[PDB]
From Swiss-Prot:
Residues 4-163 form the Macro domain. It comes from Chikungunya virus (strain S27-African prototype). The chain holds residues 1334 to 1493 of 2474 of the full protein. This is Non-structural protein 3. ADP-D-ribose binds at D13, N27, G35, G115, V116, Y117. Interacts with mRNA-capping enzyme nsP1. Interacts (via C-terminus) with host G3BP1; this interaction inhibits the formation of host stress granules on viral mRNAs and the nsp3-G3BP1 complexes bind viral RNAs and probably orchestrate the assembly of viral replication complexes. Interacts (via C-terminus) with host G3BP2; this interaction inhibits the formation of host stress granules on viral mRNAs and the nsp3-G3BP2 complexes bind viral RNAs and probably orchestrate the assembly of viral replication complexes. Interacts (via C-terminus) with host NAP1L1. It is found in: Host cytoplasmic vesicle membrane.
Amino acid sequence: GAMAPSYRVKRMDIAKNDEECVVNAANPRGLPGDGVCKAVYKKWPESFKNSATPVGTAKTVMCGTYPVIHAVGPNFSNYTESEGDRELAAAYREVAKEVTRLGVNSVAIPLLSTGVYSGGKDRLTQSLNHLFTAMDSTDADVVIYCRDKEWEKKISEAIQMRT
Ligand SMILES: [Cl-]
Ligand SMILES: [Cl-]
């Protein structure tokens, strides 16, 4: 576990993380895909061997000794708001189980279902709150990765409001 488990946020490419494992915003088929998933495929392509897994689940594949946790959020273009919300909460619960099983002291996480899978809605609060629900009981240092300055600002505010 980390000495004083914490949440942080960084505005940079998750493929350049400084943590002991990474969470991929995966597609269910294990394809190279787009956005975070494509960056993860270019950095850790060996981790896409038999990485296909259903919506709401997480599947870990090693790249060397570095764990890639493929977490499949719902595409809100396809799911109802209600069913999508359930599957998004479930994907993060499965990430917490994998982080625990691996024994890592830190994990790099993106906000699931906030990009290509957002159905064109702002889902920062919805996705972050489900990340907290799952990860609050874990002792790994969590570092959230984002792209946009206004996302960094709001994520940082949400973290600090609990401290
Ligand atoms: Cl970067
Ligand atoms: Cl997404």
